[PDB]
Design a protein around this ligand. Structure first.
Ligand SMILES: [Mg+2]
Lengths: 94, 56, 222, 146, 97, 113, 98, 226
DNA sequence: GCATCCGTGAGTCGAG
């Protein structure tokens, strides 16, 4: 299973809303290069290589992990799309 | 060219699929459980390994 | 290459030990012997026989004490005793008390070089007028010897007890496949050891590996 | 030359050569069609000074997951003794490639009683259940099948 | 078994345990000798079998024998296939089959 | 592993003293798992002969071949004195450790079957 | 046996005779008639299904053979008996869910 | 109460077979010692095998030689059975030459003899030759461990050389008996007997010793915790 | 209201 899946389903009125939130967040992480993350250095998802532990490349894993913390806010009509995209491009340029 | 494939390629592939899942499907797909998602584990050899509990 | 040994420990009573990578198959080659050894040949101390004053046998019931003789001998089985004298092969512990009191392992009269690891181990509950006078024999041994197999008696009316020598309470091991570069067939050995606290999981392991190594020297001279 | 190594003078892979996916079995050139070189192609071509060849590479290669040893070739050309090819066909080449196939995971075994199954695990001899005299078993069939 | 006996070996410690569990299964007649019982099992086509991993036996006696088995024409080598992108179809533009 | 033996050698003999039962057993008069009456109640030789302090001991006994997983016995688990096989104890443990909750684990399992 | 026979895979001797030559490629037999017959052998020939059809000599030089005796084995036959698989030592028991 | 080092007996028939007794041992050590050795013996004991073959006038394994009864396939299958012992332990590779013809049945003994190389089974049939049949080959033999398929090693000394599957292990079979023993005071003691068959390239004994060394060496790996 | 005609359906994936 995915870690804390039960809690995640707990967080939402519809499992599909969970899925959407996770997907969108992952898109955000990818777009802004993970530098917009709400995770602290010790919470950063890791990945085993020959070299060593590097940041987990998988943005969805990240997204769900972030969601568990409660640092993230989700819902409908929070902010106009313009404002969101642009404020994020100001806060974390690409 | 298959002979031109170094091992670092494979190591990279392991990095590529990380966290990712793939869909497995058997026919006839009678109900929605005829397709299921699994995080894949790369294996040598040519056949797909399936978990015993999902066979039913 | 040279396999890497790794350790995770909880107190003196539990440990996990990982050894990887190993050539194909070697995971169980090492794992099984060590387990057999760890469950049999590791030196420890057990309660072999017990005498209760008034009591005449195992299934008798003590008046003024709640737990029947059986429950008592069981609690005894749970007694963890540590001989500080490397040459000490056995000891007798005496305990007497009475009245409204709950008897605990600390009530055993202090002896020579002897540690009671679990002083708080309950033995029996005694009520008003309830009397308990008993002597229990603790021997250094290995493995597990049922009562009827050692069959030791210091005195008549003593009841022999199943001897839980092994300080190792449990051993589980698991081998799983591991990849090192191009090699996908390698073995990773995980070994979990539960001790009663007298020895240490790491200690127990090392004693086991040692026993084995030494046993390998038997194929020396015809 | 790495790519052409096992090809004889006429372009056909040499008998005995081991061929893997991607390898050329029979070299062949086709004439490039009406060419519309993109402006990018012109600037590039200009930068390297080389000229675009008349012919595309259409050579027959070993398909993915196929290959082996080249055991045979046959070559038929227009206008040599005894041979006539369908109209317009200049020549026809056939390469016979062999492979020695060992049993493997995914392969299928059966007996004459309808017991059939795929090989799921190839165990090293020392894991195989064995008789007291040390003779290991060859195959392990689950009784639940009966 | 005969050869074994001549070669100077007696019933293995483990064969005894398996024989125990066997007579618990009603497979052999109790009180009969270890050889006689092992034979009783052999007539039922069962043998004492040693797990190569542990060295310990299989708790029960097991059916072992020669079976005729064929390798059928269906091999993974032929059947394994995958595609990222590839040939599409004229009218539909959907991938070929 | 969770099945229990039923042996017919004992064949429901009644005894006044457990010691009598045990001696009988060792004489080969009565089988380890046989239903027998001692004192008043119906019991088995194995339960009396073998009484384990904790599950770890039962299983250590099984390891040494003193008993089999399917032999019925007496094990002290979670404060209560149980009559079951080491096997069933092992199953309950499997579940327990699997879900990392021992009390719930105990609730879920049907131990007597 | 009769199956290997009626399907022409194995090669047989026409009349009583004596083996003259034996090669991987061919078998030459001198019969009673005195006439010297040569039998070419199909070697590593591909079939519709891609399986190899080849015959191999089952006799040796100077060997006496009667009419109907086996001179060569088909694909998947052993001394004239149909050989589809192998005889393996098998144990019927579960094994770790594999 | 503590047991003391047991008697170690050795019963050998030539270089092919051996029986190795150890008694007495604490209860259970029969297999505790028996098995890990069997496993190691069956798997990790170095030997020698034919890695590659070159036949004069043969381009690949699916060929057939004129004059010869055996197809190259069967010939390779026979060379697969060749057991060759290297006398000098510093020697890791040999190339045997065989040149034969005329109405003869070639055997392993027909290889041109090499120094520090002994063919344990010179009686091994290789190819049956006929009038005018010429068989001239170079077979490479290597020392190695376990089972390495031609596909893995791909060893060719020359252009037309045919890589061969190498079954290195010199050990043909391993059994171990665990029987009851006593010192009179103690019952339930067990004596251990390792019966070990070999191709002859190494010796049941040599095998055993190598096995033990492997095992102890492995026990070493438990040295440095982390 | 019933007989009878025509027209439309009748597993999936695979290989080939
Ligand atoms: Mg008892």
């Amino acid at each position: 299973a995915e870690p804390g899946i039960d809690k995640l389903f707990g967080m939402v009125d519809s499992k599909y809303r969970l899925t959407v939130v996770v997907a969108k967040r992952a898109q955000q992480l990818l777009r802004h290069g993970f530098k917009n993350t709400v995770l602290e250095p010790e919470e950063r998802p890791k990945m085993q290589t020959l070299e060593g532990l590097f940041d987990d490349p998988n943005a969805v894993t990240w997204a769900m992990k972030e969601l568990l913390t409660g640092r993230l806010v989700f819902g409908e009509n929070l902010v106009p799309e313009d404002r969101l995209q642009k404020e994020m491009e100001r806060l974390y340029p690409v | 060219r298959q002979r031109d494939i170094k091992d670092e390629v494979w190591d990279a592939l392991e990095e590529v699929i990380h966290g990712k899942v793939v869909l497995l499907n058997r026919a006839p797909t009678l109900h929605r459980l005829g397709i299921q998602a699994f995080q894949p584990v790369l294996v040598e050899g040519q056949s797909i390994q399936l978990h015993p509990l999902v066979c039913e | 290459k040279a396999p890497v040994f790794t350790v995770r420990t909880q107190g003196r009573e539990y440990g996990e030990f990982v050894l990887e990578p190993l050539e194909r198959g070697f995971g169980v080659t090492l794992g099984n012997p060590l387990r057999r050894i760890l469950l049999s040949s590791i030196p420890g101390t057990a309660v072999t026989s017990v005498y209760i004053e008034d009591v005449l046998h195992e299934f008798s019931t003590i008046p003024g004490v709640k737990e029947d003789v059986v429950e008592i001998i069981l609690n005894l089985k749970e007694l963890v005793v540590r001989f500080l004298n490397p040459s000490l092969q056995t000891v007798t512990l005496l305990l007497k008390a009475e009245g409204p009191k709950e008897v605990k392992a600390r009530d055993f009269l202090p002896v020579a070089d002897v540690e009671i690891m679990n002083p708080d181990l309950h033995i029996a509950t005694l009520e008003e007028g309830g009397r308990l006078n008993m002597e229990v024999r603790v021997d250094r041994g290995v493995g597990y010897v049922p009562a009827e197999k050692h069959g030791i008696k210091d005195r008549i009316n003593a009841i022999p007890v199943d001897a839980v020598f092994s300080p190792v309470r449990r051993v589980a091991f698991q081998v799983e496949d591991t990849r090192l570069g191009q090699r996908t067939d390698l073995d990773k050995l995980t070994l979990r050891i539960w001790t009663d606290g007298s020895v240490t999981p790491l200690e127990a392991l090392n004693q086991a590996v040692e026993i084995l190594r030494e046993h390998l020297t038997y194929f020396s001279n015809p | 030359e790495a790519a052409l190594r096992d090809l004889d003078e006429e372009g056909v892979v040499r008998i005995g050569a081991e061929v893997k996916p991607g390898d050329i079995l029979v070299g062949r050139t086709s004439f490039k069609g009406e060419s519309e070189p993109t402006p990018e192609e012109r600037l590039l071509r200009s930068i390297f000074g080389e000229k675009a060849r008349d012919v595309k590479d259409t050579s027959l290669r070993v398909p993915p997951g196929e290959g082996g040893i080249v055991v045979r070739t046959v070559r038929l050309r227009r206008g040599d003794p005894g041979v006539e090819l369908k109209p317009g066909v200049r020549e026809v080449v056939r390469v016979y490639v062999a492979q020695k196939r060992k049993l493997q995971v995914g392969d299928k075994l059966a007996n004459r009683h309808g017991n059939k199954g795929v090989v799921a695990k190839i165990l090293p001899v020392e894991d195989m259940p064995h008789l007291p005299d040390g003779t290991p078993v060859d195959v392990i069939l689950n009784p639940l099948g009966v | 078994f005969g050869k074994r006996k001549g070669e100077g070996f007696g019933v293995d410690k483990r064969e005894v345990e398996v024989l125990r569990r066997a007579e618990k299964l009603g497979l052999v007649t109790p009180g009969k000798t270890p050889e006689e019982q092992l034979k009783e099992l052999f007539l039922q086509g069962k043998v004492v079998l040693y797990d190569g991993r542990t060295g310990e036996p299989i708790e029960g006696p097991i059916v072992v024998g020669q079976m005729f088995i064929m390798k059928l024409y269906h091999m993974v080598e032929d059947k394994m296939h995958a595609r990222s992108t590839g040939p599409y179809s004229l009218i539909t533009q959907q991938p070929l089959g | 592993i969770t099945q229990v033996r039923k042996e017919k050698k004992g064949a429901g003999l009644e005894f006044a003293t457990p010691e009598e039962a045990l001696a009988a057993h060792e004489r080969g008069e009565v089988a380890l798992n046989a239903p027998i009456k001692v004192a008043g109640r119906e019991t088995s030789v194995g339960r009396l002969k073998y009484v384990f302090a904790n599950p770890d001991e039962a299983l250590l006994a099984v390891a040494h071949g003193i008993v089999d997983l399917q032999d019925v016995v007496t094990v002290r688990y979670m404060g209560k004195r149980l009559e079951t096989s080491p096997g069933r104890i092992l199953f309950a443990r499997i579940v327990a450790e699997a879900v990392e909750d021992e009390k719930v684990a105990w609730e879920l399992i049907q131990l007597d079957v | 046996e009769r199956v290997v026979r009626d399907s022409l895979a194995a090669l047989y001797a026409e009349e009583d005779g004596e083996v003259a030559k034996v090669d991987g490629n061919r078998i030459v037999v001198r019969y009673e008639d005195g006439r010297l017959v040569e039998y070419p052998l199909r070697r590593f020939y591909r079939s519709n299904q891609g399986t190899a059809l080849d015959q191999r000599p089952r006799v040796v030089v100077g060997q006496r053979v009667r009419k109907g005796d086996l001179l060569a084995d088909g694909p998947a036959s052993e001394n004239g008996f149909l050989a589809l698989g192998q005889n393996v030592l098998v144990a019927i028991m579960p094994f770790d869910g594999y």
